[PDB]
């Protein structure tokens, strides 16, 4: 049981900056030390082997060194598509082992959200639930705060988040918050409006709509 | 160019057994190599689980040497994978992976997520959101598709049979109160192109066999 221990764990690059990862073996290796990348839903794709040989196919961006116990690989000019998670993997003995991971994010310009709120589809309406949705697109940092207002009543523990991954072009998030109520509660109400407060927003936003 | 395909039930119960089998073209499993399987629980990081070489010579990772095995089909071209005695720590996608001699791994396949409950599969409802705007506007607008109460994971998401891509974002599932799942996948277009285009979202949630289209219009 050789143990792959990486860092860091998580780390935020500023565009077209030089990204470093390191691992630290439990013995001597040497050698036997691959670099893998994954971007989320997808299967790991090699980058380095051996531990500084180059796969055909993969940017001359990425490189490795290091022997033994230490090794490091570096991406000399961070691009977007590079917006994933590292691992390294032993080659000395089974069982065979990975690093935690490195999360890499990259720390583009500040964007600001664009928001747009949707009522509830007559379809599911006649089906009893109301979900009323408030898309945050394209905007960085991750951080941003939603509150629900109905006829300015402030709504907690009824909405739900999501917020996708990180763009491979523009390196933007989007967030998705989803009211649900009862559909006899979503008419003995007018107004509905997605507040959201944000680093790129001067001031907070207020998208709504009414019956 | 090998090919890894990976199926089996997306969905076993508790401590029952998971069953998985690799599809393997384009390279023969008895030609060289080494055969292996890996999984990774969500949010977590990859562990290897054990391997058949191409001579039918196997081994494993311990801490799974008791309630796993490996077998393979030279007349089809697949090695398999017995789990037995399943539990939540079982819940991962799981990979085909060929090996070579470095060893690294060069090819992989999709991942298959398995995942282990005693809970029954429900087919999703599919919603629509109208766009933010007329085609009138000259701006871009936003519309999505909802798909609401589904399990288990994964559903997927396409747009106009996937020819429409770009603007296109599906956001992970988000587990409800009621123990369901729940995504919603949006697109962001020019104004100009509802009056022009149709767009539609192909949800599609293989455990329930459910493959549904919804016009999305104002």
């Known amino acids: 049981e050789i143990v792959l221990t990486q860092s860091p764990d998580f780390q935020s690059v500023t565009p077209k900056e030089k990204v470093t990862i390191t691992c630290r073996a439990s013995?001597?290796?040497?050698?036997?030390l691959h670099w893998y990348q994954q971007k989320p839903d997808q299967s790991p794709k090699l980058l380095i082997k051996?531990?500084?040989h180059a796969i055909s196919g993969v940017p001359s961006r990425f490189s490795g060194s290091g022997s033994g116990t230490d090794f490091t690989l570096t991406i000399n000019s961070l691009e977007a598509e590079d917006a994933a998670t590292y691992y390294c993997?032993?080659?000395?003995?089974?069982?065979?082992?990975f690093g935690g991971g490195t999360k890499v994010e990259i720390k583009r310009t500040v964007a600001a959200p664009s928001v747009f709120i949707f009522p509830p589809s007559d379809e599911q309406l006649k089906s009893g639930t109301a979900s009323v949705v408030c898309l945050l697109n394209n905007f960085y940092p991750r951080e941003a705060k939603v509150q629900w207002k109905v006829d300015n009543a402030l709504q907690s523990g009824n909405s739900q988040e999501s917020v996708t991954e990180q763009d491979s072009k523009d390196s933007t998030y989007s967030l998705s918050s989803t009211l649900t109520l009862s559909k006899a509660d979503y008419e003995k109400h007018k107004v509905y409006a997605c507040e959201v407060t944000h680093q790129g927003l001067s001031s907070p936003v207020t998208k709504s709509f009414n019956r | 160019q090998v090919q890894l395909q990976e199926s089996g039930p997306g969905l076993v119960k508790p401590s029952d057994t998971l069953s998985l089998t690799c599809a393997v073209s384009g390279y023969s499993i008895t030609g060289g190599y080494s055969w292996h399987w890996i999984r990774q629980p969500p949010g977590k990081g990859l562990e290897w689980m054990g391997y058949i070489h191409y001579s039918g010579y196997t081994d494993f990772n311990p801490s799974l040497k008791t309630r796993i095995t490996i077998s393979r089909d030279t007349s089809k071209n697949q090695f398999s994978l017995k789990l037995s005695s399943v539990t939540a720590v079982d819940t991962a996608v799981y990979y085909c992976?060929?090996?070579?001699?470095?060893?690294?791994?060069?090819?992989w396949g999709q991942g298959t997520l398995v995942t282990v409950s005693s809970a029954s599969t429900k087919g999703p409802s599919v919603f629509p959101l109208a766009p933010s705007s007329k085609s009138t506007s000259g701006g871009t607008a936003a519309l999505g598709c909802l798909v609401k109460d589904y399990f288990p994971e994964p559903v997927t998401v396409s747009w106009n049979s996937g020819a429409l891509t770009s603007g296109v974002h599906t956001f992970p599932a988000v587990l409800q109160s009621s123990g369901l799942y729940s995504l919603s996948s949006v697109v962001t277009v020019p104004s100009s192109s509802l009056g022009t285009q149709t767009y539609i979202c192909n949800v599609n949630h293989k455990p329930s066999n459910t493959k549904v289209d919804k016009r999305v219009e104002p």
């Open positions: 051996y531990a500084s």
């Open positions: 013995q001597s290796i040497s050698d036997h």
């Open positions: 992976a060929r090996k070579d001699p470095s060893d690294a791994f060069p090819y």
């Open positions: 993997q032993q080659g000395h003995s089974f069982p065979l082992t």
